């Protein structure tokens, strides 16, 4: 349906949880014969004010996208938002288990998936702030799709930056230098993030290459990696990293946003690239 009964909707186990909120595996089971399908179901931890308007944005951010690259929404119920369910479940996982069986083509069908979904969240005013492989799902084999829209905003028609009040609480070494610095979020921060995303697809996500580990080496955590990135250091190509697709890395972290190149600017060449692999 659009609307689901709580008392149908049952629990199995939790996908993830993080903020006040948690993603849920349950059986939309209105039989009660365990035949019923399978959906993710989100709710909060907190039953105060911002946090339920925060969710309540959520919902309708979610429901209003349309894209093949972007997890599904199905309805919600009444306090929880139902949402499809994909039992591969994310992307840092599967390249981490797949290692082996993935190329370089596949990797790029990959980056192109996300770019396009990108492209597409972009035409809708609406910043993700929490692009990394840990919020990617596999859809499929050949199939990637953007999920946790728990940060995203959308920009007013008058603005194209967002600037956030608190500090961030996800992995540091995700974030433009203008979010460290400032809290200001744009699809510009979205790209710098999305360059992380190639990072983490051509290193498969090994943490012995992870951005973590790679900081850590390259020596307050938050100012020494704005110093860092401020004197112009960056992530060292994956190994046996495509120096193209290194280069396009290098594009996405350029220090300026107004620098960085648009994701309907990335995509054909993301195309390009997978089609000469
Ligand atoms: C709770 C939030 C902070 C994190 S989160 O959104 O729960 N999250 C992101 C994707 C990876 C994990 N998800 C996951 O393993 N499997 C899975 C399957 N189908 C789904 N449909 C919708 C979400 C979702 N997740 C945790």
């Known amino acids: 349906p659009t609307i689901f009964e709580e008392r149908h ?16 595996l349950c059986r939309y089971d209105p039989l009660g014969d365990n035949t019923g399908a399978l959906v993710a179901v989100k709710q909060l931890q907190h039953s105060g004010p911002d946090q339920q308007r925060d969710f309540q944005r959520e919902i309708q951010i979610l429901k209003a996208l349309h894209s093949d690259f972007i997890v599904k929404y199905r309805g919600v119920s009444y306090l929880r938002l139902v949402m499809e369910y994909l039992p591969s479940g994310c992307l840092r996982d599967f390249l981490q288990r797949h290692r082996a069986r993935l190329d370089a083509s596949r990797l790029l069908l990959y980056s192109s998936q996300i770019c396009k979904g990108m492209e597409y969240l972009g035409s809708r005013r609406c910043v993700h702030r929490d692009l990394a492989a840990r919020n990617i799902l596999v859809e499929s084999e050949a ?15 008058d603005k194209d930056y967002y600037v956030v ?25 979205d790209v710098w993030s999305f360059g992380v995303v190639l990072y983490e697809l051509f290193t498969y996500c090994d943490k012995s290459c992870s951005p973590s ?34 280069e396009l890395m290098k594009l996405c972290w350029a220090p300026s946003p107004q620098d960085r190149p648009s994701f309907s600017a990335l995509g054909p060449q993301l195309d390009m690239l997978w089609s000469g692999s």
Request: negative net charge; contains cysteine; charged residues 20%.
């Open 143 to 157: 199939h990637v799709k953007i999920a946790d829209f728990g940060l995203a905003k959308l920009l007013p028609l």
């Open 9 to 24: 909707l049952k629990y199995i186990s939790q996908l993830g949880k993080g903020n006040f909120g948690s993603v849920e």
């Open 213 to 246: 580990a790679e900081f850590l080496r390259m020596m307050p955590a938050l100012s020494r990696l704005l110093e860092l990135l401020e004197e112009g250091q960056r992530l060292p190509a994956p190994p046996a990293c495509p120096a193209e697709v290194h």
């Open 165 to 189: 009040r608190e500090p961030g609480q996800s992995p540091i070494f995700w974030y433009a230098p203008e979010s460290l610095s400032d809290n200001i979020f744009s699809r510009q921060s």
